[PDB]
Design a protein around this ligand. Structure first.
Ligand code: HEM
Ligand code: HEM
Ligand code: HEM
Ligand code: HEM
Lengths: 145, 139, 145, 139
């Protein structure tokens, strides 16, 4: 449900996103701010301190994978439901992740983008990205529907 | 909350400083753009960009948040009148409080990049959620 | 999805349900338990006390309409998305009702059915009706998707 | 939580009586059947119908709720160990507390038709909500 202007703004801002650290930051901040989500990552090592979470190589690598999935969803904005079918089955039929955590992660990603880009992250850019992350969460929660 | 959370929130809001009204207006504009269903609560408002009405409302919200920061240990008593207005007269759906809290956090992240560490982020999330629970405790 | 046994149980419990009192009780109980939902029914008159809510003819008739919509959805369990398209447009574009209130009302209806049917409202029957009301809420919130 | 709400909850839970463990077991069974994703928190449990482990856990939950009814004005202090357990050791998603509250309400409605007036329904709903916030307050 993105206008061409919204799609262009989203693409332009995503072009400057560091794909090596943004996903790790988003996932680590999710773990710190919503600590019940740490239940799903018990094999990631020590997550007791925010510094330990943000310094965790496994958290960084998984954030890289999640950011790659987000970029894949951004490349196909008109087929999010079909892009995230396998990931939806993995998250729902195997991990039992509540779909509200998808929205939580999307909002954490929006906060990380704001923290990185500052005044470049204008309210219209944020609105376009909110549409994007809401669509991604809805597509990822399709098995629950 | 926690004493460390209180210190983090006090530091972040203090370094927000005298721009709090601008921050609140920007957060309200972000909420109106991202979640247009929140605009139904302001039908007699001019909700265009740069509107003086939204500027004044953001200033009011920012002053309320500053008072809540100053009275972190007595928030339910400091916010009693506001909680009665939000729940009895306005009857705001409690999801909109989460929406406004998210937009406030986004404004803070965009304006204080150095201070938006993960720990400060968690502290601010806890503070704003506590203000939202106080404001939604009179239904 | 509902198994044939769950569908049979749901239909059997539905025939017993009164079509003139259950929906009004569910709407009234929603208005009492979640009083921010009264913001959508300002033209319904006095709603200040629970007795005033449950004695409201407008609340009774509107609950009758909602119960009829639920019955229509039950007769078309495989086409919930197409059954509630016009109602979804009415609730989202015209009234701006948050989709959380749909699940709230479905849960209040489940509570009303339990209160009316007692020991006959077994946990399997409740699970089938939870699936039914979740499907109805998802169909009514589809326009936000 | 208003004094009328406390009186309503106390009357309803007293009328529940000595069936508290049975009602807790039925609520847990309803939760497991309706929301099977909540079953993952009990991996070592035998979660079949009539299970002794489910019966014992339902008794434990019912005694906790009876204590909370006895301590409405002191819930954070009465439920401190349980809140620590659920927030730190178990890391229960806060949505499952809503699910269990709904299943408890359904069990009470099904077993006490006369007591389940709309006012008692609202009082019990907010009592269970407050218990859930206390159990999730250590996040
Ligand atoms: C909201 C958007 C999300 C996206 C786009 C996403 C994406 C991904 C990706 C790409 C993988 C890699 C799977 C593989 O390598 O085979 C994965 C796995 C995983 N995700 Fe997510 N994720 C999201 C949200 C979440 C959330 C919120 C949680 C927990 C609270 C979560 C928990 C997990 C876990 C535990 C795995 C590991 C499972 C496995 O690899 O077998 N995910 N996700
Ligand atoms: C942290 C959250 C919030 C704070 C601190 C806050 C604060 C305030 C303040 C200080 C006022 C002015 C009261 C007065 O002038 O006497 C107000 C009014 C109002 N608020 Fe909020 N509010 C919050 C959340 C919300 C949300 C989420 C909504 C709707 C989505 C909302 C809708 C309104 C409305 C409609 C008014 C009436 C304004 C007018 O009539 O001029 N509030 N709020
Ligand atoms: C969850 C299942 C629901 C169903 C099946 C349902 C069904 C209906 C039906 C059949 C109508 C009548 C439309 C007409 O006469 O043209 C209606 C109207 C309305 N509904 Fe719902 N409803 C649901 C939930 C809700 C909730 C939770 C709210 C508010 C919190 C709500 C607010 C309204 C309002 C304000 C109207 C008046 C609009 C009109 O009469 O045209 N509905 N709904
Ligand atoms: C009103 C809500 C609740 C109450 C009063 C409650 C109460 C209790 C009590 C009394 C215990 C045993 C404590 C002990 O043995 O020392 C317990 C343990 C436990 N609770 Fe809850 N609880 C509630 C909600 C939940 C929910 C919603 C879940 C999961 C969806 C949950 C999962 C557990 C688990 C996994 C245990 C550990 C039992 C075991 O491993 O043997 N609880 N709870």
């Amino acid at each position: 449900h993105l206008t061409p202007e919204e799609k262009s703004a989203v693409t332009a801002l995503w072009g400057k996103v560091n794909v090596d650290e943004v996903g790790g930051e988003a996932l680590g901040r999710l773990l710190v701010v919503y600590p019940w989500t740490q239940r799903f990552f018990e094999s990631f090592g020590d997550l007791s301190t925010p510094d330990a979470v943000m310094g965790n190589p496994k958290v960084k690598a998984h954030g890289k994978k999640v950011l790659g999935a987000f970029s894949d969803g951004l490349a196909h904005l008109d087929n999010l439901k079909g892009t995230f079918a396998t990931l939806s089955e993995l998250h729902c039929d195997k991990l039992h992740v509540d779909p509200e955590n998808f929205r939580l992660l999307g909002n954490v990603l929006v906060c990380v983008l704001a923290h990185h880009f500052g005044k470049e992250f204008t309210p219209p850019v944020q609105a376009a990205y909110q549409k994007v992350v809401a669509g991604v969460a809805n597509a990822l929660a399709h098995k629950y529907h | 909350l926690s004493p460390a959370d209180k210190t983090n929130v006090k530091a972040a809001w203090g370094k927000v400083g005298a721009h709090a009204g601008e921050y609140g207006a920007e957060a309200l504009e972000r909420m109106f753009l991202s979640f247009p269903t929140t605009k139904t609560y302001f039908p007699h408002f001019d909700l265009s960009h740069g509107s003086a009405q939204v500027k004044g409302h953001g200033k009011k919200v920012a002053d309320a948040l500053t008072n809540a920061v100053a009275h972190v240990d007595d928030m339910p008593n400091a916010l009693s009148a506001l909680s009665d207005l939000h729940a009895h007269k306005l009857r705001v759906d409690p999801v909109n409080f989460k929406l406004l809290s998210h937009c406030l956090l986004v404004t803070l992240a965009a304006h204080l990049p150095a201070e938006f560490t993960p720990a400060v982020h968690a502290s601010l999330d806890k503070f704003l959620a506590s203000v939202s629970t106080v404001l939604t405790s009179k239904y």
